């Protein structure tokens, strides 16, 4: 039951990072509200 | 105790920091922000890096993690978020909370 | 690792959850929110409880912790925050993030 | 040096809770933006 009817959580987003490495940036000084 | 607390940060702040590590460029975090009609959710996954830039001042790198998202998810993201959040950015450490709030307010639209 | 991560939640979200415990009424957290001219800081400390209310639905209790704050700090708080944040409140779990954002935006004025 | 010239942090706010117990609420349904 719980895998299917449970409340979704951001914990399961860990999978999104699989295979991505952190090894050219647009520079922004501040972000408005 | 640390996991009950991370769960609370998820429900209070709509963000989860999955892990942190230090590599050759600096201190990094894997992060997801957003909220979960059961089909209505708005979530961005990104890496956030803290790197020594010029004069050893810590700069922040944002690198969105978009490879595994579907075209439907991206369209929805793009309709809610500013265009700059779809590329790698650099910004001052003093703007970090402003950055979080920009993604948060956008995801909550 | 858990402490580097809590530090990041502090700088990203301007909040720190100091501890959590479960007592006779429910699940509780001791929390501070806000930001630190070096004399300019705006911070609220509060307890946040998760309690079973009617029909076992979890309700949220907010209890501000104001006893040790100075009159100068309270005046500043009162000038930034809505009046309801100076008493104990109950609100639905589904409004938790809205609550956080209300304090956050107010403290960041 | 570090106690005096270091960056202040919310970690030191733990002291604010000393002596406060969690043992009459105004009910609010939602908070605006």
Automatic annotation (TrEMBL), chains A, D:
Which superkingdom does the taxonomy of this entry point to?
Eukaryota
Family per record: Belongs to the peptidase C48 family.
Name of the protein this chain belongs to: Ulp2p
Source organism:
Saccharomyces cerevisiae x Saccharomyces kudriavzevii (strain VIN7)
User: What fragment of the whole protein does this chain represent?
Assistant: 825 to 844 of 900
């Amino acid at each position: 039951n719980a895998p299917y009817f449970g409340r979704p959580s951001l914990k399961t987003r860990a999978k999104q990072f699989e295979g991505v490495s952190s090894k050219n940036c647009r520079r922004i000084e501040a972000f408005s509200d | 105790n640390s996991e009950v607390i991370k769960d609370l940060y998820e429900y209070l702040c709509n963000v989860r920091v999955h892990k942190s590590y230090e590599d050759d460029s600096g201190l990094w975090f894997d992060i997801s922000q957003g909220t979960h009609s059961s089909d209505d959710y708005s979530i961005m996954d990104y890496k956030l890096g803290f790197v020594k830039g010029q004069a050893q001042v810590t700069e922040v790198i944002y690198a969105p993690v978009l490879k595994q998202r579907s075209t439907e998810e991206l369209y929805s993201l793009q309709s809610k978020l500013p265009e700059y959040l779809f590329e790698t950015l650099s910004f001052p450490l003093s703007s970090l909370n402003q950055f979080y709030n920009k993604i948060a307010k956008s995801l909550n639209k």
